[PDB]
């Protein structure tokens, strides 16, 4: 018991002992549910104990389930008791269309009140502009305002006082601060005992505003975070639906707005699309100018076009989803009857409407629009902007789900959505443009197909069915066409069709066309694949017409290359490695290799930026000739592959593609050492039979060999006898001179000496260099591969000798 004296001697030890063994227990009691222990029935000065109990009571409300309205209401009652006031109220800060507003949320709060008697429903709020009122003065000043007497105040108003049958003498307020933007205002109406609120009362207000600010700050941050999350989700889902595919404006706007229906948080919204017809055709405007009909007098867009909601889509969400599309809606429609969407199209301004039935400008429905009693209260209508500032629609958002009127956060959330939708009109604009471009391209392709196709009258020049049987070619039987063709076609032996020295100089273009069908017959690919004879004749004539009438790369060049390929495959016994279908595709590829040649090489296409160069990247003309040939074959009347199998047709098309693309020299020059190895393998092999068997299986070896055959047939003019080579070289030089002149005239570039018209006397030297550079390697290796190709090697050597003699003569002449 003597220890009790020790504790009293040094109370510091006792305090430390308590702070050790009882402070935790006491704090636990204070932080428990409990209740305030301060007598609230008097007006005595608050003791430090009573101050602590009040502070602990306020801190007790700080929980995870922080209900802002309830917690602020409690501290409002504590402020009433502390400040000796009669009542106080709290006004939220809401931002309508630019003009800020103050709407009450907690009203008539006294010391003996409850939440049910102070909480204000959204339809019971008292909105207040910033300009008028002491509260408006508080928000504008952004600082505490003390009013010792309402009569002397220059901002005091009696609107609520008359509305609530109350008299206010002393007003003390303070705006709740969350950064810089005001969130709420808490104000006092009267002093129970005292002339006014003293400076001590003010100091109490700012002291106890910490809890109110913390509670209000959490609510404001939560609301802002939720709104930003909703905005982000809206933008992301709208972008997904926009980029799903390319469609028109009606389908696109339907998807994006339907998808964000959960994030929008609106009971109803409707979008009306404006017609884009700026200018009406001449026959439509004639009656207006002639007095038959009166001119338009109704609402007009800022751009000057008539306002015409040609299609309105509405979304109903309060009950059962009833999304509806109304083509050509009448003015009686619930969305357009009020006239707000019409007004927005007239002006182009974002409109927020609070208590729409009370509005007088627009005739909003004042009766329940739905059987369940749904009634329009809050409306928000905004335009769709568009990139060219031409309003393409009006989006109108009706009653909010929570019941509160639309504020600046909802305005911004819908503003972003409308801005995104207006930006996403390039896709519908491109959709129509691409469709029109494709239709125009198809029309012009049909035009070129007709212009290159052999008509029904021209085919009678070969397939003379009218003069023999009196019927049209499409009516005659297959045997009848063959008998006419057998009589009409020339004989291969007589014309030396399968020789290496064939000359087309003494033959007409029709005779050359007749020759090609004879080649196809001789190759025995007509009966094997049941090629329609009428189509075969029409196909060759269409090729002849499609070949341009330019100097060198004309139909005669196209036939000679095909003639060279046929002579190879027959005489040189190079068909042993190729199937009949492969032979069929190869001759057709040779014939079509130079179809529709403009007369200028690949370099001119790049330099002049011809549309071929933009389309085809690597081989400009060679791909174009392949494309045009495949387009020609795609025609039903010109298709000679129509009777082939699906696998057979694909194999022929691929092989033709390989040949036609390989026709160029750039690919040949790179992929020619491979041909050197291929003939080396043939020499390594012992007899021709095993080597022929190897080629009959291996495909990459055949394809490389085929490319060499193409580049040997293309340069087959050089191996013809001297009488033929002398003239063809002049044609080639003339075409190159024409291209050089075109270059000099169009691109202002100096032509190369090969293409130069002035250097016409250097042609033998260029031909000698060309022979030593390109043709010699091909014809030397082909002769080694097959002994039957020896006459080709004899031809090129003789032509090279003649050109060398001419070049030597020219050099001797220039020596002087």
């Amino acid at each position: 018991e003597e220890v009790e004296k020790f504790l009293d001697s040094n109370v510091s030890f006792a305090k430390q002992y308590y702070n050790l063994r009882y402070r935790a227990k006491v704090i636990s009691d204070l932080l428990g549910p409990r209740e305030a222990a301060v007598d609230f029935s008097n007006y005595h000065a608050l003791n430090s104990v009573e101050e602590s109990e009040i502070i602990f009571d306020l801190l007790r409300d700080f929980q995870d389930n922080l209900q802002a309205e309830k917690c602020v209401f409690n501290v409002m009652k504590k402020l009433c008791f502390l400040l000796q006031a009669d009542r106080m109220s709290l006004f939220m800060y809401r931002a309508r269309n630019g003009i800020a507003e103050l709407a009450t949320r907690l009203f008539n709060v006294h010391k003996d009140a409850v939440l049910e008697e102070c909480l204000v429903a959204p339809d019971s709020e008292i909105v207040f502009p910033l300009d008028m009122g002491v509260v408006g003065h508080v928000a504008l000043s952004k600082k505490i305002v003390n009013v010792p007497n309402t009569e002397e105040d220059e901002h005091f108003c009696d609107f609520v006082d008359t509305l609530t049958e109350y008299q206010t003498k002393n007003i003390l307020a303070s705006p709740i601060m969350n950064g810089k933007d005001v969130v709420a205002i808490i104000m006092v109406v009267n002093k129970v005992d005292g002339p006014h609120f003293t400076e001590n009362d003010e100091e109490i207000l700012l002291k106890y505003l910490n809890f109110a600010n913390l509670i209000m700050k959490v609510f404001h941050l939560s609301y802002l975070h939720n709104c930003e999350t909703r905005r982000g989700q809206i933008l992301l889902w709208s972008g997904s639906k926009v980029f799903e595919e390319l469609t028109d404006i009606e389908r696109q706007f339907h998807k994006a707005l339907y998808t964000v229906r959960a994030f929008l948080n609106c009971d109803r919204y409707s979008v009306g699309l404006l017609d884009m017809t700026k200018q009406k055709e001449f026959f439509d405007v004639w009656p207006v100018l002639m007095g038959e009909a009166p001119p338009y007098a109704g609402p007009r867009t800022p751009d000057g076009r008539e306002i015409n909601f040609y299609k309105v889509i509405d979304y109903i969400l309060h009950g059962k989803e009833d999304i509806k599309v109304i083509p050509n809606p009448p003015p009686d429609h619930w969305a357009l009857v009020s006239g707000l969407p019409t007004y927005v199209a007239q002006n182009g301004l974002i409109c927020n409407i609070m208590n729409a039935p009370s509005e007088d400008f627009f005739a909003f429905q004042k009766e329940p629009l739905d059987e369940s009693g749904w009634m329009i209260k809050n409306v928000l209508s905004m335009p769709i902007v568009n990139k060219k500032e031409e309003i393409v629609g009006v989006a109108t958002f009706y009653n909010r789900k929570d019941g509160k009127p639309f504020d600046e956060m909802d305005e911004t959330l819908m503003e972003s959505l409308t801005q995104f939708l207006g930006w996403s009109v390039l896709n519908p604009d491109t959709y129509e443009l691409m469709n029109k471009l494709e239709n125009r391209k198809d029309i012009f392709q049909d035009m070129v197909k007709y212009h290159v196709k052999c008509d029904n009258e021209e085919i009678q020049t070969i397939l003379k069915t009218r003069e023999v049987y009196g019927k049209e070619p499409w009516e005659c039987e297959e045997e009848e066409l063959a008998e006419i063709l057998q009589g009409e076609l020339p004989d291969a032996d007589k014309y030396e069709i399968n020789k290496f020295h064939f000359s087309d100089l003494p033959l007409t273009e029709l005779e050359l066309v007749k020759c090609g069908i004879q080649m196809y017959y001789e190759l025995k690919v007509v009966d094997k694949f049941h090629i329609p004879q009428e189509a075969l004749v029409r196909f060759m004539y269409s090729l002849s017409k499609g070949y341009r009438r330019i100097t060198y790369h004309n139909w005669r060049h196209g036939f000679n290359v095909g003639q060279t390929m046929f002579s190879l495959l027959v005489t040189g016994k190079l068909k042993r490695y190729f199937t009949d279908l492969e032979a069929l595709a190869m001759v057709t590829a040779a014939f079509c290799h130079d179809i529709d040649h403009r007369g200028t090489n690949n370099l001119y296409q790049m330099k002049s930026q011809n549309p071929l160069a933009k389309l085809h990247g690597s081989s400009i003309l060679e791909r174009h000739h392949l494309e045009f040939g495949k387009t020609l074959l795609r025609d039903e009347s010109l298709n000679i592959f129509q009777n082939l199998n699906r696998r057979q047709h694909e194999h022929a098309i691929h092989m033709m593609d390989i040949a036609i693309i390989a026709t160029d020299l750039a690919l040949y020059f790179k992929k020619r050492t491979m041909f050197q190895k291929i003939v080396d393998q043939s020499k390594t092999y012992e007899t021709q039979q095993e080597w022929t068997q190897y080629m009959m299986l291996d495909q990459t070896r055949k394809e490389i060999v085929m490319a060499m055959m193409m580049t040997a047939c293309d340069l087959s003019a050089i191996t013809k006898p001297w009488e033929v080579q002398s003239k063809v070289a002049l044609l080639v030089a003339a075409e190159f001179w024409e291209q050089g002149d075109l270059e000099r005239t169009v691109l202002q570039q100096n032509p190369i000496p090969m293409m130069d018209r002035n250097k016409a006397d250097e042609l033998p030297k260029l031909q000698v260099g060309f022979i030593d550079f390109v043709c010699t390697f091909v014809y030397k290796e082909f002769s080694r591969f097959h002994e039957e190709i020896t006459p080709m090697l004899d031809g090129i050597t003789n032509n090279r000798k003649e050109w060398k003699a001419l070049a030597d003569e020219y050099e001797t002449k220039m020596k002087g």
Binding site: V160, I350, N355, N601, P753
Partner: protein, 34 residues
């Protein structure tokens, strides 16, 4: 109720409606042809 207003939100000053402005301020081989 506390505010004595049952019908709808009331404003002291009632004139022609005001609307927001649309937001737009923020946004050898070479010799031979080849």
């Amino acid at each position: 109720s506390a505010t004595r207003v049952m019908g709808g939100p009331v404003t002291p000053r009632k004139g022609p409606p005001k609307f927001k402005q649309r937001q737009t301020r923020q946004f050898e081989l070479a010799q031979y042809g080849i």
